[PDB]
Symmetry: C3
Subunit: 120 residues, 3 copies
């Protein structure tokens, strides 16, 4: 239907840098991934590191699209795999009527994502 763009976001993630940083106590990483997921992903050459990085890139792209938007709580945004966005608590309510498009990708050393927010 008739829609307007509300926000845009792009994010790049070095997978090797991600693997080094992900397993740290008390971080936003720790609030986002389980201890087991983070240990696994701690091995930069793993498939687990590859995917977790892409999920993190997507979440970041979505945050950028929103933060630059007229809506202004990171544990309220979850990205599941195609990439799906699930929202909770406060933000869920903010964007109840906003359509979220996200796409992710990974190649060798790098993961990337783009997010576009849309509303009538």
């Amino acid at each position: 239907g008739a829609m307007g763009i509300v926000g845009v976001g792009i994010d790049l993630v070095s997978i090797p840098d991600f693997a080094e940083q992900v397993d740290q106590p008390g971080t936003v990483f720790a609030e986002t991934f389980t201890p087991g997921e983070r240990r696994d992903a701690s091995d930069k050459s793993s498939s687990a590191a590859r995917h977790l990085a892409a999920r993190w890139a997507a979440k970041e792209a979505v945050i950028k699209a929103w933060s630059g938007s007229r809506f202004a709580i990171h544990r309220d945004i979850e990205v599941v795999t195609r990439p799906r966005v699930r929202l909770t608590g406060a933000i869920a309510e903010y964007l109840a009527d906003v359509t979220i498009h996200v796409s992710l990708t990974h190649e060798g050393d790098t993961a990337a994502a783009v997010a576009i927010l849309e509303a009538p």
Copy 2:
């Protein structure tokens, strides 16, 4: 005019990895690029490898935008260079009334593309 977004896609392509893989018989590569194009591109430091990778990234971004869309045959989608999309057979008909925006880029080791599908 008044439009809604139908799908989004992003894709990253390691050019060196592309050059190694592209020249393989019986692959989707073989259905997409001519034997000559694929041999040329087999040299990772070439300009031919650079461009073929960007064309492949674009095609992939477009596929992602569509696959995640309400439309659900890869030799029916062709990308020509600015990036242009030409469709044939089945998919041509599916997206007869869908507007396709694609953009590509290459820098050193990496090619990238984004695609956005749009419809009233």
Copy 3:
């Protein structure tokens, strides 16, 4: 409101390659960044190189979105940091009624940006 997409652009920038090239007299770089900014950014491991590259990637993404558009003077487009677009002279007038969405990112060796042009 009801909007249609007018153009799309993506751009990738090797930061090390940027640092080598940026400080060159009489170039588009020289028309875009001050001598001081360009000398600073000449050090590839600097934070100044990181940000200038991201600004350059954004400007390029915006140029791509426009060049592929029905509007057809690079010192008329400026990108300021979130990324903001400021236009002058000719192009300012062209896009007076066009909405510009831009997003940028940097990770290690690479900067990236995407731009989307929109109009009723």
